[PDB]
Structure 1
Amino acid sequence: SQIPRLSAINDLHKIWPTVEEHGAAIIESFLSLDIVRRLNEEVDPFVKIEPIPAAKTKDHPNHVLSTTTRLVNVLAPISKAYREDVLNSKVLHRICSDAFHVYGDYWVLMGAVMELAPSNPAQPLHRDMRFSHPIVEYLKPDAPATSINFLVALSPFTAENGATHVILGSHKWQNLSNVSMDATVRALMNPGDALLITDSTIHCGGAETTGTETRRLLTITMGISQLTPLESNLAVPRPVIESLTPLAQRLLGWASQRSAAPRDIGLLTIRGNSIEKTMNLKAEQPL
């Protein structure tokens, strides 16, 4: 039983329902090849200078990722394609508003480029959010997903070069005795395709077996605005923030947020007014 594949254009309304049911779906042509190209060029040098996840020079080292993984987050200051095209993706927003309507506004918990070196080993099978948001494990098993992860291929995903594994239906598993690589299927994808999973979908990066290919992806974890992002945009220069759309500003934590409660009193407000209203934050101003 393989991962369902859907078109970004023609099957839009079916995407969230497909993930909510099966725990994963592949969105064909999520990002155009041109956006993929520009993102790659813009992040290239930052990927090259990134040290190992647990570098001794970091004061929040990542001890979980392999030493042959490079992860670069806080992409807005680095990439125009990211902060303009990706952050305003119509497809992304429709899926997120489908997924998160019961809770309220959503934002970016982390947008990162990950590059895996040749012969990168497979990751252990896992659920996301367990090294940053312990609170998630205390949710009732049937609580609607509070975050989802778009894993966008920035280069080809093949079985040979370590394409992600997923276990279909595992977002609903409580008993984990059946977890094994034997239960997985692969996310074979062209650049610009995206694998969409929830925070409960059991998955792992695959083993790079060619010894020569360098696989790269854009992981966009989208989550309800009630949960704190893994990454901060507080240090992004104001001129960059004010070049964004109001929607993109909100996604980066440069706006107040709303819950879905009928008489919502809001998140990140200031004496009854919004961040953007208080700071007189401009939008859509070219650099």
Structure 2
Amino acid sequence: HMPPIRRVNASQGSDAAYQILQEDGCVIVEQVICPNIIAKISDDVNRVMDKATIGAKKGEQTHIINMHNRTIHMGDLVLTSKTYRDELLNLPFAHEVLEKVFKKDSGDYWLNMGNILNMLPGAEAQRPHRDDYLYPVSQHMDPATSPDLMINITFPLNEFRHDNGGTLLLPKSHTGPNADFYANAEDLPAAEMQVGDALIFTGKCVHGGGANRSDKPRIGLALAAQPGYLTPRESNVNVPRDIVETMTPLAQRMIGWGTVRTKDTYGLNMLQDKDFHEALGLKSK
């Protein structure tokens, strides 16, 4: 018996989605965002897609997730899309869920990164994995009781199905012990969904990209958030201060332009023994 991927409409409230996410480790939330927003973001991203890296980045092994050369992962979305800085990073449903996940166990949260997941025609499935493997401390904690280190929110930019490689997930796989093998990709259900929908799964949910057996690319956008005490994979210190001061305080903290406090009230990422904003006089929308 393989349990299916469960879905809620966003009009049912982020409590329903959060209860499915803590019982299964994954949930598809339908009609969570206006599809026109996503169309603008796909516009912006397609302009600059010819400048992205195919395969692994420099000096990173590829056998934990089966990182290969018919996928494109592209970052730097903050500079690429204003609609991303303005609409997506402030979506209140997403922050309702992320606050339910992170607030008591860890405190404030920010992005690990925002990432374009391009599964090219011909791309094979990845090895099912846990994303919290990125952080070494996660192997020294019991998954049944340890706090969540990562939450992934994936917005399909075109439609996700099984045949074009929509994300494969293993529901209810998020409490068991860490293992070097979990499942074969061919045994997992795919997250099927449309522009406007989002898939949400935790750093402990077993998942991976599927095989794109179609003749068009399958592209999603993944907002990955984590506790503020974990170092983001992507820094944003090179974003113009004048761009950053048109963003909201919450979104400025998301891209690392703000102090993050632990659930114990201690600040990380401070400037000159003060608040990040206070020390810079950083304005915001």
TM-score, reference length from structure 1: 0.91
Higher mean Cα deviation, 72-81 or 7-16? 7-16
* Residues 46, 72 of structure 1: 8 Å contact kept: no
Once the 2 structures are TM-superposed, how far is the Cα of residue 98 of structure 1 from its aligned partner? 0.6
Amino acid at match of 1:279: L
Report the Cα distance in structure 1 between the residues aligned to 2:59 and 2:88, rounded to whole angstroms: 27
Deviation, 1:120, is 0.9
- Give the superposition deviation at 1:48: 2.2
Structure 1 pair 266–51 and aligned structure 2 pair: CA distance change class (3 A) = closer
Residue identity matched to 1:34 = N
| Paired residue secondary structure (2:111) | strand
Q: Deviations over 1:220-249 (max 9, x none)?
A: 111110111111111111111111001110
* Matched residue, 1:238: 241
- Residues 53, 61 of structure 1: 8 Å contact kept: no
Q: Of residues 185, 191, 199 in structure 1, which corresponds to 2:189?
A: 185
Residues in 2 aligned to 1:10 and 1:190: alpha-carbon distance in whole angstroms: 18
Letter in 1 for 2:172: G
Q: Distance in 1 between matches of 2:4 and 2:175?
A: 17
Q: 1:238 to 1:39 in 2, by over 3 A?
A: same
1:94 is matched with 96
Partner residue, 2:167? 164
2:141 paired with 1:139: yes
Q: Deviation at 1:38?
A: 0.3
Query: 1:144 offset after TM fit, Å?
Result: 2.1
> Is the Cα contact below 8 Å between 2:53 and 2:74 reproduced in 1?
no
Aligned to 2:124: 121
1:278 alignment partner in structure 2: 279
Give the C-alpha shift of residue 17 in structure 1. Answer: 1.8
Q: Deviation at 1:3?
A: 1.0
Within the candidate set 111, 123, 133, 2:114 is matched to: 111
Which sits farther off after the overlay, 198-207 or 184-193? 184-193
Alignment match, 1:198 = 202
State the identity %: 30
* Aligned counterparts of 1:127 and 1:265: Cα–Cα separation in 2: 29
Conservation of the 8 A alpha-carbon contact between 1:74 and 1:232: no
Aligned counterpart, 2:29: 27
Letter in 2 for 1:6: V
The offset of 1:183, in angstroms, is 4.6
1:208 maps to which of 189, 206, 212: 212
SS of alignment partner, residue 229 of structure 2? coil
1:10 CA drift (Å):
2.2
Q: For 1:272 and 1:25, how far apart are their aligned partners in 2?
A: 40
Name the amino acid aligned to 1:169: K
CA distance in 1, matches of 2:51, 2:185: 33
Question: Structure 1 residues 88-97 or 181-190, which shifts more?
Answer: 181-190
Long gaps (5+) in structure 2: none
CA gap 1:215/1:178 in 2 versus in 1, 3 angstroms:
closer
Question: SS in structure 2 opposite 1:77?
Answer: helix
Note the alpha carbon deviations across 1:33-69, whole angstroms, 9 max, x for none. Answer: 1111000001112222213133xxx656674522111
Give the partner amino acid of 1:244. Answer: M
* C-alpha contact 1:53 1:62 (8 A) present in aligned 2: no
Which amino acid is 1:26 matched to?
A: I
Q: Which amino acid aligns with 1:205?
A: G
Distance in 2 (CA, whole Å) between partners of 1:167 and 1:61 is 26
Count of matched residue pairs: 277
Query: How far did 1:270 drift?
Result: 3.2
Alignment root-mean-square deviation, CA = 1.8
Distance 1:267 1:175 in 2: 29
Amino acid at match of 2:20: T
Counterpart residue number, 1:4: 6
* C-alpha distance in 1 between matches for 2:60 and 2:142: 31
Cα deviation code 1:98-155 (max 9, x no counterpart): 111111001011101121111111111111132x321222223211212111111111
Mapping of 1:72-91 within 5 angstroms? 72-91=74-93
Paired with 2:279 and 2:239, the residues of 1 have a C-alpha distance of 19
The separation in 2 between residues aligned to 1:186 and 1:74, in whole angstroms, is 27
Aligned equivalent of 1:14: 16
